[PDB]
Design an enzyme around this catalytic site. Structure first.
Site, PDB file in Angstrom:
ATOM      1  NE  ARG A   1      -3.777   2.417   1.855  1.00 44.59           N
ATOM      2  CZ  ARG A   1      -5.028   2.489   2.285  1.00 44.59           C
ATOM      3  NH1 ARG A   1      -5.580   1.428   2.843  1.00 44.59           N
ATOM      4  NH2 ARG A   1      -5.723   3.605   2.144  1.00 44.59           N
TER       5      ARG A   1
ATOM      6  NE  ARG B   1      -7.888   2.549  -1.471  1.00 43.34           N
ATOM      7  CZ  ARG B   1      -8.118   3.401  -0.467  1.00 43.34           C
ATOM      8  NH1 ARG B   1      -8.287   2.970   0.780  1.00 43.34           N
ATOM      9  NH2 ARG B   1      -8.174   4.705  -0.721  1.00 43.34           N
TER      10      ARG B   1
ATOM     11  CG  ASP C   1     -11.550   0.996   6.270  1.00 46.40           C
ATOM     12  OD1 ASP C   1     -10.370   1.404   6.326  1.00 46.40           O
ATOM     13  OD2 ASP C   1     -12.376   1.429   5.438  1.00 46.40           O
TER      14      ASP C   1
HETATM   15  N1  LIG Z   1     -11.838   2.499  12.088  1.00 45.67           N
HETATM   16  C1  LIG Z   1     -10.666   2.717  11.455  1.00 45.67           C
HETATM   17  N2  LIG Z   1     -10.041   1.773  10.728  1.00 45.67           N
HETATM   18  C2  LIG Z   1      -8.871   1.999  10.093  1.00 45.67           C
HETATM   19  N3  LIG Z   1      -8.227   3.176  10.115  1.00 45.67           N
HETATM   20  C3  LIG Z   1      -8.758   4.198  10.815  1.00 45.67           C
HETATM   21  C4  LIG Z   1     -10.023   4.028  11.535  1.00 45.67           C
HETATM   22  N4  LIG Z   1     -10.329   5.184  12.147  1.00 45.67           N
HETATM   23  C5  LIG Z   1      -9.341   6.048  11.828  1.00 45.67           C
HETATM   24  N5  LIG Z   1      -8.404   5.458  11.056  1.00 45.67           N
HETATM   25  C6  LIG Z   1      -7.241   6.201  10.538  1.00 45.67           C
HETATM   26  O1  LIG Z   1      -7.541   6.473   9.163  1.00 45.67           O
HETATM   27  C7  LIG Z   1      -6.301   6.885   8.596  1.00 45.67           C
HETATM   28  C8  LIG Z   1      -6.373   7.056   7.086  1.00 45.67           C
HETATM   29  O2  LIG Z   1      -6.760   5.825   6.505  1.00 45.67           O
HETATM   30  P1  LIG Z   1      -7.170   5.727   4.954  1.00 45.67           P
HETATM   31  O3  LIG Z   1      -7.136   4.286   4.635  1.00 45.67           O
HETATM   32  O4  LIG Z   1      -6.199   6.618   4.070  1.00 45.67           O
HETATM   33  C9  LIG Z   1      -8.850   6.364   4.828  1.00 45.67           C
HETATM   34  P2  LIG Z   1      -9.845   5.411   3.651  1.00 45.67           P
HETATM   35  O5  LIG Z   1     -10.059   4.029   4.133  1.00 45.67           O
HETATM   36  O6  LIG Z   1      -9.205   5.473   2.199  1.00 45.67           O
HETATM   37  O7  LIG Z   1     -11.259   6.154   3.581  1.00 45.67           O
HETATM   38  P3  LIG Z   1     -12.563   5.880   4.493  1.00 45.67           P
HETATM   39  O8  LIG Z   1     -12.112   6.059   5.907  1.00 45.67           O
HETATM   40  O9  LIG Z   1     -13.516   6.943   4.014  1.00 45.67           O
HETATM   41  O10 LIG Z   1     -13.029   4.478   4.195  1.00 45.67           O
HETATM   42  C10 LIG Z   1      -5.363   5.793   9.094  1.00 45.67           C
HETATM   43  O11 LIG Z   1      -3.991   6.200   9.042  1.00 45.67           O
HETATM   44  C11 LIG Z   1      -5.884   5.518  10.508  1.00 45.67           C
HETATM   45  O12 LIG Z   1      -5.058   6.123  11.504  1.00 45.67           O
HETATM   46 CA   LIG Z   2     -11.849   2.587   3.512  1.00 44.80          CA
HETATM   47 CA   LIG Z   3      -8.610   2.647   5.440  1.00 45.78          CA
END
Ligand SMILES: Nc1ncnc2c1ncn2[C@@H]1O[C@H](COP(=O)(O)CP(=O)(O)OP(=O)(O)O)[C@@H](O)[C@H]1O
Ligand SMILES: [Ca+2]
Ligand SMILES: [Ca+2]
Ligand SMILES: Cc1cccc(C(=O)CSc2nc3c(=O)[nH]c(N)nc3[nH]2)c1
Ligand SMILES: [Ca+2]
EC number: 2.7.6.3
Length: 159
Positions: free
Chosen positions: A83, A93, A98
């Protein structure tokens, strides 16, 4: 022990291979055991649409880790599976892990927000979750079955 529910997404570098590798890696997380893996679903992208379709799934992971300790491991796995952070918001990605739910806990730290802030609006999270945990109740008392009964979500197609 607590049951955490993790959403898996991949739309780059052979999503089936990425997700299978992620499931192996999730099993290797300490103080933790996979209880249930959903079906794999091929889903059209939400947000920016100029990217390949996703493989989405959900996993139930029993754990005695602290919530941020679990996050440490999920981030490590994403990074170890190549990633790379690009500037585009919500871009494609190799792997996205999540944390949707961590038992009935409500967590708001600098690194971690649980329940996932938007999961109740995303069919690609809710449908695989319902497959593995049809009786699920959210921390605010809302029933997963009731959300899916009441709200319009497109049906998911299996991968
Ligand atoms: N429930 C959760 N699960 C995973 N990461 C989380 C989270 N809550 C906050 N984060 C934080 O989210 C930050 C950014 O993650 P990203 O993967 O870039 C967002 P994304 O998943 O692309 O979008 P989304 O949150 O809208 O799904 C991570 O570095 C982490 O610290
Ligand atoms: Ca996501
Ligand atoms: Ca994420
Ligand atoms: C309700 C709403 C509005 C705007 C954006 C989004 C995203 O999910 C953005 S990031 C994302 N992750 C996934 C994903 O894992 N699967 C699919 N199909 N689409 C995805 N999109 C959701
Ligand atoms: Ca383990």
């Amino acid at each position: 022990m607590t049951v955490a529910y993790i959403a898996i997404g991949s739309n780059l570098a052979s999503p089936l291979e990425q997700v299978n590798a992620a499931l192996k890696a999730l099993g290797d997380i300490p103080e933790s055991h996979i209880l249930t893996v959903s079906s794999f679903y091929r889903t059209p992208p939400l947000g920016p649409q100029d990217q390949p379709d996703y493989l989405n799934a959900a996993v139930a992971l029993e754990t005695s880790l602290a919530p941020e300790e679990l996050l440490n491991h999920t981030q490590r796995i994403e990074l170890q599976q190549g990633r790379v952070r690009k500037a585009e918001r919500w871009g494609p990605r190799t792997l996205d892990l999540d944390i949707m739910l961590f038992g009935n806990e409500v967590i708001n730290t600098e690194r971690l927000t649980v329940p996932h802030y938007d999961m109740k609006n995303r069919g690609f999270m809710l449908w695989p979750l319902f497959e593995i945990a049809p009786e699920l109740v959210f921390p605010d008392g809302e029933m997963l079955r009731q959300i899916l009964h009441t709200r319009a979500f497109d049906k998911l197609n299996k991968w």
